[PDB]
PDB file of C-alpha atoms in Angstrom:
ATOM      1  CA  UNK A   1       7.709  19.488  -1.291  1.00  0.00           C
ATOM      2  CA  UNK A   2       9.597  16.228  -0.778  1.00  0.00           C
ATOM      3  CA  UNK A   3      10.361  12.846  -2.384  1.00  0.00           C
ATOM      4  CA  UNK A   4       8.218  10.859   0.037  1.00  0.00           C
ATOM      5  CA  UNK A   5       8.424   9.634   3.616  1.00  0.00           C
ATOM      6  CA  UNK A   6      10.792   6.917   4.861  1.00  0.00           C
ATOM      7  CA  UNK A   7      10.279   4.850   8.012  1.00  0.00           C
ATOM      8  CA  UNK A   8      13.082   4.574  10.581  1.00  0.00           C
ATOM      9  CA  UNK A   9      15.466   1.622  10.227  1.00  0.00           C
ATOM     10  CA  UNK A  10      15.394  -0.514  13.383  1.00  0.00           C
ATOM     11  CA  UNK A  11      17.771  -3.307  14.536  1.00  0.00           C
ATOM     12  CA  UNK A  12      17.465  -6.933  13.389  1.00  0.00           C
ATOM     13  CA  UNK A  13      19.970  -8.744  15.612  1.00  0.00           C
ATOM     14  CA  UNK A  14      20.728 -11.623  13.243  1.00  0.00           C
ATOM     15  CA  UNK A  15      17.038 -12.176  12.475  1.00  0.00           C
ATOM     16  CA  UNK A  16      17.906 -11.817   8.800  1.00  0.00           C
ATOM     17  CA  UNK A  17      19.909 -15.028   9.109  1.00  0.00           C
ATOM     18  CA  UNK A  18      16.769 -16.956  10.044  1.00  0.00           C
ATOM     19  CA  UNK A  19      15.016 -16.138   6.794  1.00  0.00           C
ATOM     20  CA  UNK A  20      14.602 -18.770   4.081  1.00  0.00           C
ATOM     21  CA  UNK A  21      12.235 -19.447   1.201  1.00  0.00           C
ATOM     22  CA  UNK A  22       9.765 -22.315   1.112  1.00  0.00           C
ATOM     23  CA  UNK A  23       8.502 -23.561  -2.226  1.00  0.00           C
ATOM     24  CA  UNK A  24       5.780 -26.167  -2.633  1.00  0.00           C
ATOM     25  CA  UNK A  25       4.449 -26.515  -6.151  1.00  0.00           C
ATOM     26  CA  UNK A  26       4.359 -23.079  -7.786  1.00  0.00           C
ATOM     27  CA  UNK A  27       4.136 -21.090  -4.553  1.00  0.00           C
ATOM     28  CA  UNK A  28       7.216 -19.517  -2.966  1.00  0.00           C
ATOM     29  CA  UNK A  29       7.052 -17.624   0.317  1.00  0.00           C
ATOM     30  CA  UNK A  30       9.249 -16.669   3.269  1.00  0.00           C
ATOM     31  CA  UNK A  31       9.822 -18.833   6.319  1.00  0.00           C
ATOM     32  CA  UNK A  32      11.442 -18.673   9.748  1.00  0.00           C
ATOM     33  CA  UNK A  33      14.450 -20.912  10.362  1.00  0.00           C
ATOM     34  CA  UNK A  34      15.283 -21.814  13.971  1.00  0.00           C
ATOM     35  CA  UNK A  35      17.657 -24.619  14.945  1.00  0.00           C
ATOM     36  CA  UNK A  36      16.553 -27.539  12.779  1.00  0.00           C
ATOM     37  CA  UNK A  37      13.003 -26.359  12.179  1.00  0.00           C
ATOM     38  CA  UNK A  38      11.390 -24.120   9.561  1.00  0.00           C
ATOM     39  CA  UNK A  39       8.134 -22.193   9.938  1.00  0.00           C
ATOM     40  CA  UNK A  40       5.903 -20.801   7.184  1.00  0.00           C
ATOM     41  CA  UNK A  41       2.253 -20.099   6.256  1.00  0.00           C
ATOM     42  CA  UNK A  42       0.608 -23.441   5.468  1.00  0.00           C
ATOM     43  CA  UNK A  43      -1.174 -21.998   2.436  1.00  0.00           C
ATOM     44  CA  UNK A  44       2.145 -22.530   0.653  1.00  0.00           C
ATOM     45  CA  UNK A  45       0.642 -25.913  -0.234  1.00  0.00           C
ATOM     46  CA  UNK A  46      -2.268 -24.281  -2.036  1.00  0.00           C
ATOM     47  CA  UNK A  47      -2.189 -23.310  -5.690  1.00  0.00           C
ATOM     48  CA  UNK A  48      -4.209 -20.187  -6.601  1.00  0.00           C
ATOM     49  CA  UNK A  49      -7.220 -22.496  -7.144  1.00  0.00           C
ATOM     50  CA  UNK A  50      -7.265 -24.261  -3.757  1.00  0.00           C
ATOM     51  CA  UNK A  51      -8.017 -20.977  -1.972  1.00  0.00           C
ATOM     52  CA  UNK A  52     -11.793 -20.622  -2.241  1.00  0.00           C
ATOM     53  CA  UNK A  53     -12.176 -23.569   0.139  1.00  0.00           C
ATOM     54  CA  UNK A  54      -8.996 -25.455   1.104  1.00  0.00           C
ATOM     55  CA  UNK A  55      -9.002 -28.477   3.407  1.00  0.00           C
ATOM     56  CA  UNK A  56      -5.350 -28.580   4.467  1.00  0.00           C
ATOM     57  CA  UNK A  57      -5.809 -31.964   6.139  1.00  0.00           C
ATOM     58  CA  UNK A  58      -5.981 -33.647   2.723  1.00  0.00           C
ATOM     59  CA  UNK A  59      -3.938 -31.149   0.717  1.00  0.00           C
ATOM     60  CA  UNK A  60      -1.109 -32.136   3.045  1.00  0.00           C
ATOM     61  CA  UNK A  61      -1.292 -35.949   2.945  1.00  0.00           C
ATOM     62  CA  UNK A  62      -0.675 -35.432  -0.772  1.00  0.00           C
ATOM     63  CA  UNK A  63       2.767 -33.980  -0.092  1.00  0.00           C
ATOM     64  CA  UNK A  64       5.935 -35.722   1.098  1.00  0.00           C
ATOM     65  CA  UNK A  65       9.203 -34.256   2.332  1.00  0.00           C
ATOM     66  CA  UNK A  66      10.364 -33.834  -1.233  1.00  0.00           C
ATOM     67  CA  UNK A  67       7.277 -31.774  -2.083  1.00  0.00           C
ATOM     68  CA  UNK A  68       8.995 -28.917  -0.235  1.00  0.00           C
ATOM     69  CA  UNK A  69      12.039 -26.958  -1.414  1.00  0.00           C
ATOM     70  CA  UNK A  70      13.662 -24.951   1.391  1.00  0.00           C
ATOM     71  CA  UNK A  71      16.329 -22.460   0.350  1.00  0.00           C
ATOM     72  CA  UNK A  72      18.809 -20.524   2.478  1.00  0.00           C
ATOM     73  CA  UNK A  73      20.366 -18.372  -0.210  1.00  0.00           C
ATOM     74  CA  UNK A  74      22.197 -20.623  -2.650  1.00  0.00           C
ATOM     75  CA  UNK A  75      21.986 -23.348   0.002  1.00  0.00           C
ATOM     76  CA  UNK A  76      19.167 -25.888   0.155  1.00  0.00           C
ATOM     77  CA  UNK A  77      17.865 -27.259   3.450  1.00  0.00           C
ATOM     78  CA  UNK A  78      16.599 -30.810   2.937  1.00  0.00           C
ATOM     79  CA  UNK A  79      13.158 -31.428   4.469  1.00  0.00           C
ATOM     80  CA  UNK A  80      13.270 -34.552   6.659  1.00  0.00           C
ATOM     81  CA  UNK A  81       9.893 -33.952   8.272  1.00  0.00           C
ATOM     82  CA  UNK A  82       6.656 -31.997   7.923  1.00  0.00           C
ATOM     83  CA  UNK A  83       3.709 -31.441  10.263  1.00  0.00           C
ATOM     84  CA  UNK A  84       1.033 -28.768  10.608  1.00  0.00           C
ATOM     85  CA  UNK A  85       0.413 -26.414  13.528  1.00  0.00           C
ATOM     86  CA  UNK A  86      -2.880 -24.620  13.080  1.00  0.00           C
ATOM     87  CA  UNK A  87      -2.095 -22.276  10.184  1.00  0.00           C
ATOM     88  CA  UNK A  88       1.653 -22.766  10.218  1.00  0.00           C
ATOM     89  CA  UNK A  89       3.557 -25.512   8.514  1.00  0.00           C
ATOM     90  CA  UNK A  90       6.294 -27.084  10.613  1.00  0.00           C
ATOM     91  CA  UNK A  91       9.254 -28.398   8.627  1.00  0.00           C
ATOM     92  CA  UNK A  92      12.191 -30.384   9.989  1.00  0.00           C
ATOM     93  CA  UNK A  93      15.424 -29.698   8.103  1.00  0.00           C
ATOM     94  CA  UNK A  94      18.568 -31.845   7.988  1.00  0.00           C
ATOM     95  CA  UNK A  95      20.612 -29.189   9.783  1.00  0.00           C
ATOM     96  CA  UNK A  96      20.497 -26.397  12.374  1.00  0.00           C
ATOM     97  CA  UNK A  97      20.701 -22.700  11.597  1.00  0.00           C
ATOM     98  CA  UNK A  98      24.106 -21.688  13.018  1.00  0.00           C
ATOM     99  CA  UNK A  99      23.090 -18.060  13.513  1.00  0.00           C
ATOM    100  CA  UNK A 100      19.964 -18.918  15.548  1.00  0.00           C
ATOM    101  CA  UNK A 101      19.482 -16.548  18.532  1.00  0.00           C
ATOM    102  CA  UNK A 102      18.025 -16.919  22.024  1.00  0.00           C
ATOM    103  CA  UNK A 103      14.302 -16.581  21.285  1.00  0.00           C
ATOM    104  CA  UNK A 104      10.753 -17.313  22.460  1.00  0.00           C
ATOM    105  CA  UNK A 105       7.221 -17.191  20.990  1.00  0.00           C
ATOM    106  CA  UNK A 106       5.151 -14.471  22.645  1.00  0.00           C
ATOM    107  CA  UNK A 107       1.755 -13.283  21.400  1.00  0.00           C
ATOM    108  CA  UNK A 108       1.464  -9.493  21.706  1.00  0.00           C
ATOM    109  CA  UNK A 109      -1.700  -7.448  21.197  1.00  0.00           C
ATOM    110  CA  UNK A 110      -3.050  -4.267  19.531  1.00  0.00           C
ATOM    111  CA  UNK A 111      -1.010  -1.206  20.456  1.00  0.00           C
ATOM    112  CA  UNK A 112       2.231  -3.082  21.121  1.00  0.00           C
ATOM    113  CA  UNK A 113       4.835  -2.254  18.481  1.00  0.00           C
ATOM    114  CA  UNK A 114       7.384  -4.622  16.988  1.00  0.00           C
ATOM    115  CA  UNK A 115       9.993  -4.784  14.247  1.00  0.00           C
ATOM    116  CA  UNK A 116       9.134  -6.568  11.008  1.00  0.00           C
ATOM    117  CA  UNK A 117      11.593  -7.908   8.458  1.00  0.00           C
ATOM    118  CA  UNK A 118      10.191  -7.580   4.932  1.00  0.00           C
ATOM    119  CA  UNK A 119      11.546  -9.808   2.159  1.00  0.00           C
ATOM    120  CA  UNK A 120      11.409  -8.848  -1.522  1.00  0.00           C
ATOM    121  CA  UNK A 121      11.455 -12.156  -3.423  1.00  0.00           C
ATOM    122  CA  UNK A 122      13.655 -13.422  -0.608  1.00  0.00           C
ATOM    123  CA  UNK A 123      16.563 -11.160   0.309  1.00  0.00           C
ATOM    124  CA  UNK A 124      15.865  -8.986   3.406  1.00  0.00           C
ATOM    125  CA  UNK A 125      15.016  -5.419   2.433  1.00  0.00           C
ATOM    126  CA  UNK A 126      14.863  -3.574   5.746  1.00  0.00           C
ATOM    127  CA  UNK A 127      13.482  -3.871   9.278  1.00  0.00           C
ATOM    128  CA  UNK A 128      10.437  -1.756  10.151  1.00  0.00           C
ATOM    129  CA  UNK A 129       8.396  -0.777  13.180  1.00  0.00           C
ATOM    130  CA  UNK A 130       4.684  -1.525  13.105  1.00  0.00           C
ATOM    131  CA  UNK A 131       1.806  -1.626  15.558  1.00  0.00           C
ATOM    132  CA  UNK A 132      -1.229  -3.884  15.724  1.00  0.00           C
ATOM    133  CA  UNK A 133      -4.332  -1.926  14.727  1.00  0.00           C
ATOM    134  CA  UNK A 134      -7.276  -2.414  17.108  1.00  0.00           C
ATOM    135  CA  UNK A 135      -8.833  -4.604  14.412  1.00  0.00           C
ATOM    136  CA  UNK A 136      -5.713  -6.826  14.412  1.00  0.00           C
ATOM    137  CA  UNK A 137      -4.234  -5.846  11.040  1.00  0.00           C
ATOM    138  CA  UNK A 138      -1.135  -3.921  10.006  1.00  0.00           C
ATOM    139  CA  UNK A 139      -0.770  -1.157   7.424  1.00  0.00           C
ATOM    140  CA  UNK A 140       2.465  -1.266   5.426  1.00  0.00           C
ATOM    141  CA  UNK A 141       3.369  -1.155   1.742  1.00  0.00           C
ATOM    142  CA  UNK A 142       6.643  -3.001   2.322  1.00  0.00           C
ATOM    143  CA  UNK A 143       4.631  -6.137   3.076  1.00  0.00           C
ATOM    144  CA  UNK A 144       3.085  -6.012  -0.383  1.00  0.00           C
ATOM    145  CA  UNK A 145       4.328  -8.875  -2.525  1.00  0.00           C
ATOM    146  CA  UNK A 146       5.831 -10.434   0.577  1.00  0.00           C
ATOM    147  CA  UNK A 147       4.367 -13.164   2.809  1.00  0.00           C
ATOM    148  CA  UNK A 148       5.742 -15.428   5.507  1.00  0.00           C
ATOM    149  CA  UNK A 149       7.757 -12.550   6.948  1.00  0.00           C
ATOM    150  CA  UNK A 150       8.094 -12.176  10.706  1.00  0.00           C
ATOM    151  CA  UNK A 151       7.577  -9.567  13.384  1.00  0.00           C
ATOM    152  CA  UNK A 152       9.559  -9.375  16.588  1.00  0.00           C
ATOM    153  CA  UNK A 153      10.933  -7.400  19.523  1.00  0.00           C
ATOM    154  CA  UNK A 154      14.387  -7.462  21.089  1.00  0.00           C
ATOM    155  CA  UNK A 155      15.124  -7.465  24.801  1.00  0.00           C
ATOM    156  CA  UNK A 156      18.877  -7.583  25.349  1.00  0.00           C
ATOM    157  CA  UNK A 157      20.015 -10.801  23.671  1.00  0.00           C
ATOM    158  CA  UNK A 158      16.627 -12.462  23.298  1.00  0.00           C
ATOM    159  CA  UNK A 159      14.450 -12.252  20.175  1.00  0.00           C
ATOM    160  CA  UNK A 160      10.686 -12.359  20.765  1.00  0.00           C
ATOM    161  CA  UNK A 161       8.986 -13.663  17.626  1.00  0.00           C
ATOM    162  CA  UNK A 162       5.405 -12.444  17.823  1.00  0.00           C
ATOM    163  CA  UNK A 163       4.074 -12.406  14.264  1.00  0.00           C
ATOM    164  CA  UNK A 164       4.002 -14.022  10.825  1.00  0.00           C
ATOM    165  CA  UNK A 165       2.489 -12.468   7.700  1.00  0.00           C
ATOM    166  CA  UNK A 166       0.097 -14.614   5.681  1.00  0.00           C
ATOM    167  CA  UNK A 167      -2.228 -12.793   3.295  1.00  0.00           C
ATOM    168  CA  UNK A 168      -2.909  -9.232   2.239  1.00  0.00           C
ATOM    169  CA  UNK A 169      -6.506  -8.084   2.486  1.00  0.00           C
ATOM    170  CA  UNK A 170      -8.083  -6.182  -0.421  1.00  0.00           C
ATOM    171  CA  UNK A 171      -8.334  -3.151   1.875  1.00  0.00           C
ATOM    172  CA  UNK A 172      -4.575  -2.654   1.720  1.00  0.00           C
ATOM    173  CA  UNK A 173      -3.922  -3.966   5.227  1.00  0.00           C
ATOM    174  CA  UNK A 174      -2.157  -7.205   6.186  1.00  0.00           C
ATOM    175  CA  UNK A 175      -3.230 -10.135   8.380  1.00  0.00           C
ATOM    176  CA  UNK A 176      -0.927 -12.538  10.166  1.00  0.00           C
ATOM    177  CA  UNK A 177      -0.641 -15.025  13.004  1.00  0.00           C
ATOM    178  CA  UNK A 178       1.560 -15.387  16.048  1.00  0.00           C
ATOM    179  CA  UNK A 179       4.272 -18.056  15.950  1.00  0.00           C
ATOM    180  CA  UNK A 180       1.947 -20.918  16.857  1.00  0.00           C
ATOM    181  CA  UNK A 181      -0.145 -20.595  13.728  1.00  0.00           C
ATOM    182  CA  UNK A 182      -3.070 -18.846  15.356  1.00  0.00           C
ATOM    183  CA  UNK A 183      -4.358 -15.785  13.544  1.00  0.00           C
ATOM    184  CA  UNK A 184      -4.543 -12.402  15.245  1.00  0.00           C
ATOM    185  CA  UNK A 185      -8.131 -11.376  14.622  1.00  0.00           C
ATOM    186  CA  UNK A 186     -11.144 -13.007  12.875  1.00  0.00           C
ATOM    187  CA  UNK A 187      -9.091 -13.828   9.794  1.00  0.00           C
ATOM    188  CA  UNK A 188      -8.467 -17.143   8.029  1.00  0.00           C
ATOM    189  CA  UNK A 189      -6.130 -18.619   5.418  1.00  0.00           C
ATOM    190  CA  UNK A 190      -8.546 -18.913   2.495  1.00  0.00           C
ATOM    191  CA  UNK A 191      -9.729 -16.632  -0.307  1.00  0.00           C
ATOM    192  CA  UNK A 192     -12.887 -15.095   1.132  1.00  0.00           C
ATOM    193  CA  UNK A 193     -14.497 -11.754   1.925  1.00  0.00           C
ATOM    194  CA  UNK A 194     -13.244 -11.201   5.459  1.00  0.00           C
ATOM    195  CA  UNK A 195     -11.740  -7.703   5.399  1.00  0.00           C
ATOM    196  CA  UNK A 196     -14.798  -6.139   7.044  1.00  0.00           C
ATOM    197  CA  UNK A 197     -13.940  -3.294   9.394  1.00  0.00           C
ATOM    198  CA  UNK A 198     -10.396  -2.736   8.138  1.00  0.00           C
ATOM    199  CA  UNK A 199     -11.202   0.080   5.707  1.00  0.00           C
ATOM    200  CA  UNK A 200     -11.231   2.651   8.514  1.00  0.00           C
ATOM    201  CA  UNK A 201      -8.592   5.322   7.861  1.00  0.00           C
ATOM    202  CA  UNK A 202      -6.304   6.157  10.811  1.00  0.00           C
ATOM    203  CA  UNK A 203      -6.783   9.851  11.491  1.00  0.00           C
ATOM    204  CA  UNK A 204      -3.905  10.031  13.983  1.00  0.00           C
ATOM    205  CA  UNK A 205      -1.434   9.003  11.266  1.00  0.00           C
ATOM    206  CA  UNK A 206      -2.741  11.192   8.452  1.00  0.00           C
ATOM    207  CA  UNK A 207      -2.442  14.168  10.806  1.00  0.00           C
ATOM    208  CA  UNK A 208       1.077  13.218  11.818  1.00  0.00           C
ATOM    209  CA  UNK A 209       1.825  12.760   8.134  1.00  0.00           C
ATOM    210  CA  UNK A 210       0.394  16.239   7.463  1.00  0.00           C
ATOM    211  CA  UNK A 211       2.765  17.616  10.079  1.00  0.00           C
ATOM    212  CA  UNK A 212       5.686  15.765   8.500  1.00  0.00           C
ATOM    213  CA  UNK A 213       4.659  17.518   5.287  1.00  0.00           C
ATOM    214  CA  UNK A 214       4.609  21.018   6.769  1.00  0.00           C
ATOM    215  CA  UNK A 215       8.031  20.343   8.275  1.00  0.00           C
ATOM    216  CA  UNK A 216       9.438  19.699   4.791  1.00  0.00           C
ATOM    217  CA  UNK A 217       7.876  22.543   2.811  1.00  0.00           C
ATOM    218  CA  UNK A 218       4.389  21.412   1.748  1.00  0.00           C
ATOM    219  CA  UNK A 219       2.046  24.162   2.951  1.00  0.00           C
ATOM    220  CA  UNK A 220      -0.573  24.701   0.235  1.00  0.00           C
ATOM    221  CA  UNK A 221      -3.049  22.433   2.036  1.00  0.00           C
ATOM    222  CA  UNK A 222      -2.956  24.752   5.045  1.00  0.00           C
ATOM    223  CA  UNK A 223      -5.886  27.143   5.024  1.00  0.00           C
ATOM    224  CA  UNK A 224      -6.359  29.704   7.804  1.00  0.00           C
ATOM    225  CA  UNK A 225      -9.575  28.219   9.184  1.00  0.00           C
ATOM    226  CA  UNK A 226     -10.216  26.112  12.272  1.00  0.00           C
ATOM    227  CA  UNK A 227     -12.647  23.571  13.702  1.00  0.00           C
ATOM    228  CA  UNK A 228     -13.936  22.092  16.962  1.00  0.00           C
ATOM    229  CA  UNK A 229     -13.101  18.515  17.959  1.00  0.00           C
ATOM    230  CA  UNK A 230     -16.769  17.634  17.572  1.00  0.00           C
ATOM    231  CA  UNK A 231     -17.426  19.295  14.206  1.00  0.00           C
ATOM    232  CA  UNK A 232     -14.363  17.438  12.992  1.00  0.00           C
ATOM    233  CA  UNK A 233     -15.371  13.916  14.047  1.00  0.00           C
ATOM    234  CA  UNK A 234     -18.689  14.723  12.380  1.00  0.00           C
ATOM    235  CA  UNK A 235     -16.874  14.699   9.066  1.00  0.00           C
ATOM    236  CA  UNK A 236     -14.355  12.087  10.238  1.00  0.00           C
ATOM    237  CA  UNK A 237     -16.944   9.308  10.219  1.00  0.00           C
ATOM    238  CA  UNK A 238     -18.705  10.485   7.061  1.00  0.00           C
ATOM    239  CA  UNK A 239     -15.516   9.673   5.178  1.00  0.00           C
ATOM    240  CA  UNK A 240     -14.718   6.618   7.302  1.00  0.00           C
ATOM    241  CA  UNK A 241     -12.048   8.155   9.495  1.00  0.00           C
ATOM    242  CA  UNK A 242     -11.112   7.386  13.069  1.00  0.00           C
ATOM    243  CA  UNK A 243     -12.893   9.892  15.284  1.00  0.00           C
ATOM    244  CA  UNK A 244     -10.126  11.758  17.107  1.00  0.00           C
ATOM    245  CA  UNK A 245     -10.061  11.848  20.906  1.00  0.00           C
ATOM    246  CA  UNK A 246      -8.679  14.692  23.023  1.00  0.00           C
ATOM    247  CA  UNK A 247      -6.242  11.989  24.083  1.00  0.00           C
ATOM    248  CA  UNK A 248      -4.961  11.670  20.502  1.00  0.00           C
ATOM    249  CA  UNK A 249      -4.624  15.454  20.463  1.00  0.00           C
ATOM    250  CA  UNK A 250      -2.097  15.224  23.297  1.00  0.00           C
ATOM    251  CA  UNK A 251       0.007  12.772  21.314  1.00  0.00           C
ATOM    252  CA  UNK A 252       0.240  15.381  18.551  1.00  0.00           C
ATOM    253  CA  UNK A 253       1.509  17.980  21.011  1.00  0.00           C
ATOM    254  CA  UNK A 254       5.249  17.728  20.185  1.00  0.00           C
ATOM    255  CA  UNK A 255       4.738  18.252  16.445  1.00  0.00           C
ATOM    256  CA  UNK A 256       2.235  21.053  17.023  1.00  0.00           C
ATOM    257  CA  UNK A 257       4.929  22.687  19.136  1.00  0.00           C
ATOM    258  CA  UNK A 258       7.615  22.265  16.458  1.00  0.00           C
ATOM    259  CA  UNK A 259       5.688  23.533  13.421  1.00  0.00           C
ATOM    260  CA  UNK A 260       3.647  25.939  15.503  1.00  0.00           C
ATOM    261  CA  UNK A 261       0.356  24.764  14.016  1.00  0.00           C
ATOM    262  CA  UNK A 262      -2.399  23.913  16.499  1.00  0.00           C
ATOM    263  CA  UNK A 263      -3.757  20.389  16.114  1.00  0.00           C
ATOM    264  CA  UNK A 264      -7.267  21.775  15.570  1.00  0.00           C
ATOM    265  CA  UNK A 265      -6.046  24.038  12.775  1.00  0.00           C
ATOM    266  CA  UNK A 266      -4.464  20.980  11.161  1.00  0.00           C
ATOM    267  CA  UNK A 267      -7.874  19.299  11.361  1.00  0.00           C
ATOM    268  CA  UNK A 268      -9.605  22.178   9.590  1.00  0.00           C
ATOM    269  CA  UNK A 269      -7.104  21.625   6.782  1.00  0.00           C
ATOM    270  CA  UNK A 270      -7.713  17.885   6.764  1.00  0.00           C
ATOM    271  CA  UNK A 271     -11.485  18.404   6.813  1.00  0.00           C
ATOM    272  CA  UNK A 272     -10.997  20.365   3.599  1.00  0.00           C
ATOM    273  CA  UNK A 273      -8.970  17.675   1.840  1.00  0.00           C
ATOM    274  CA  UNK A 274     -11.858  15.327   2.647  1.00  0.00           C
ATOM    275  CA  UNK A 275     -14.650  17.582   1.392  1.00  0.00           C
ATOM    276  CA  UNK A 276     -12.806  18.601  -1.794  1.00  0.00           C
ATOM    277  CA  UNK A 277      -9.980  16.139  -2.395  1.00  0.00           C
ATOM    278  CA  UNK A 278      -6.466  17.214  -3.353  1.00  0.00           C
ATOM    279  CA  UNK A 279      -7.270  17.922  -7.010  1.00  0.00           C
ATOM    280  CA  UNK A 280      -4.317  16.315  -8.749  1.00  0.00           C
ATOM    281  CA  UNK A 281      -2.218  18.068  -6.112  1.00  0.00           C
ATOM    282  CA  UNK A 282       0.517  16.421  -4.028  1.00  0.00           C
ATOM    283  CA  UNK A 283       1.863  16.139  -0.473  1.00  0.00           C
ATOM    284  CA  UNK A 284       5.303  14.613   0.044  1.00  0.00           C
ATOM    285  CA  UNK A 285       5.153  13.058  -3.413  1.00  0.00           C
ATOM    286  CA  UNK A 286       1.720  11.518  -2.893  1.00  0.00           C
ATOM    287  CA  UNK A 287      -1.660  12.109  -4.548  1.00  0.00           C
ATOM    288  CA  UNK A 288      -3.589  10.425  -1.720  1.00  0.00           C
ATOM    289  CA  UNK A 289      -3.567  10.963   2.043  1.00  0.00           C
ATOM    290  CA  UNK A 290      -1.168   8.584   3.784  1.00  0.00           C
ATOM    291  CA  UNK A 291      -1.787   6.982   7.175  1.00  0.00           C
ATOM    292  CA  UNK A 292       0.865   4.273   7.446  1.00  0.00           C
ATOM    293  CA  UNK A 293       2.998   6.576   9.597  1.00  0.00           C
ATOM    294  CA  UNK A 294       2.243   7.235  13.257  1.00  0.00           C
ATOM    295  CA  UNK A 295       3.075  10.446  15.136  1.00  0.00           C
ATOM    296  CA  UNK A 296       6.127   8.619  16.471  1.00  0.00           C
ATOM    297  CA  UNK A 297       7.452   7.441  13.102  1.00  0.00           C
ATOM    298  CA  UNK A 298       7.269  11.059  11.962  1.00  0.00           C
ATOM    299  CA  UNK A 299       8.885  12.668  15.002  1.00  0.00           C
ATOM    300  CA  UNK A 300      11.599  10.013  14.745  1.00  0.00           C
ATOM    301  CA  UNK A 301      12.831  10.995  11.277  1.00  0.00           C
ATOM    302  CA  UNK A 302      11.742  14.627  11.542  1.00  0.00           C
ATOM    303  CA  UNK A 303      13.296  15.159  14.999  1.00  0.00           C
ATOM    304  CA  UNK A 304      12.625  18.804  15.848  1.00  0.00           C
ATOM    305  CA  UNK A 305      11.871  19.909  19.414  1.00  0.00           C
ATOM    306  CA  UNK A 306      13.714  17.674  21.909  1.00  0.00           C
ATOM    307  CA  UNK A 307      12.179  15.467  24.628  1.00  0.00           C
TER     308      UNK A 307
END
């Protein structure tokens, strides 16, 4: 047994210095501060009510430069200009962020990983690695209660801002846009049922997670049965799981080598936890199967065999 899984801590390269808080009305979210400009989700101008059907074009002409309170710690950046870029809100401040790095605005895609700086109430609370699900969402509990946080990659001395968090979908995943205000995926910045096809559980991660568990003591969930790749995916879909490809099986080769448990034998164990549940039982201090951690996040912390 263990006290839970922790995700690797990646570099930030002074990205934490570009974080500020934007407050219009009763809403307060995170924003990106570069030079003399501030970026943040435009729904910061919407009160809980104006979410069922907001027309930002008019909700904006009802705000001035005073309407916005930009904070950089105990320091306030005075808004001397405001415009709108798609779903982002552009704000011109009366000063440039001294610790602004060489950057650019790229727009990655599903599969590509990037670091994300989560902000609890404001202060930076860690940099994490996340990938863009094929449906264009991201699974991470650290983004809960956040918003307006940013994702990026570092190449030498240049920061590549590629993402901004807007709203959390009821399915537990998060939707964001690139740094031009254009959403990644069929999502929108309004309160509406739009989380269709985001409830699919990532088999690859659960498995990895299950390996991470075995590596730290948890074994009870390991029966001595087995299953074919086909007979597994049969159950995979029944419970809304990603059918596993022989390709995915390769990815889980390092861990299978380390623990000495064949990937198919780990599936027979998973298939059980899906047809019977855990029964108030636990795995790495969890009563539900986790899938926020990829095979790489696991191998990272739980090193093991070297390659």
